[PDB]
């Protein structure tokens, strides 16, 4: 089921290298549930990369 949606998002959209495991990355491990919802607006793949970029920055901001 949804494991195929998560793979399609990790690979068809985010195009993350195979070295970036889904299980390893926790901040990606939560955002996948959210990106799965927005089944539309997958045409612009450049947006989800920058969104995950900024969520990773959310993950490590001490201030």
């Amino acid at each position: 089921k949804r494991d195929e949606k998560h793979r399609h998002v990790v690979n068809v959209v985010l195009e993350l290298p195979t070295e970036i495991s889904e299980a390893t990355h926790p901040v990606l491990a939560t955002m996948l549930s959210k990106y799965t919802r927005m089944s539309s607006l997958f045409n612009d793949k450049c947006a989800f990369k920058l969104d995950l970029l900024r969520m990773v920055a959310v993950s490590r901001t001490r201030r």
């Binding site: 970036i20 607006l41 450049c46 989800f48 970029l53 969520m55 490590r60």
Partner: protein
Amino acid sequence: DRQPLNPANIEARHHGVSDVPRLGAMDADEPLFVDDYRATDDEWTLQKVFYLCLMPAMTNNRACGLGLNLKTLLVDLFYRPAFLLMPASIAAQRQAVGEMLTELVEDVATDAHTPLLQACRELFLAVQFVGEHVKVLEVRAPLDHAQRQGLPDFISRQHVLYNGCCVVTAPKTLIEYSLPVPFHRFYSNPTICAALSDDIKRYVTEFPHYHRHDGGFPLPTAFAHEYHNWLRSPFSRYSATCPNVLHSVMTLAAMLYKISPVSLVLQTKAHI
């Protein structure tokens, strides 16, 4: 866009939170996504003292405005394992941040005790505050009741640059991602703007006399409204030659005194 942006419905922005719809909505004139906090009038005046008096007088109309394509730039510099994989050599770490960012952070900002990665990662944390792409805004403001006496139907055009940067010179490494946009009486430099577009470089190389900074090389038809501007040609005639001295900075403020009847009655009581 073609219609006023007054409706409070059209303005909202979200920071520190994932907005894929906003990030996609980049490049759209519509909902501009303006930050929550509004400028208080006193610092609103300091902005006009700076960009409108200080900068043209200390730069002599050499400055120019330009917007950056963040969508294709931030994804280009970042989005490497080195930044996706972040914990909570000197050259092998150059490869990690890439050739594009190494040109920027290597000598400009790193101390002998801070490696390149510990320095450049501090930059990564500002990615969470990214806003829209560069866009120009018109401001159709009628004049005050003391001045709208004659010609009541007059409406003053403005062409401010939302989400942009003043530019002293062309960015050498971001030259692939910069976007030159001359709009104002100042901030319309041919030397900067031709360095960023062959479309303007051919224009100037056919028309060398537009290279001149004083009365600008003719701005776009959207931006070429000389008469409805607040600040007409005498301002650039003055800033083109004025010596970059503090008093030549103040004298623009005295060029800015209004010709209201209340301005006249108030100004004359002072014996000015």
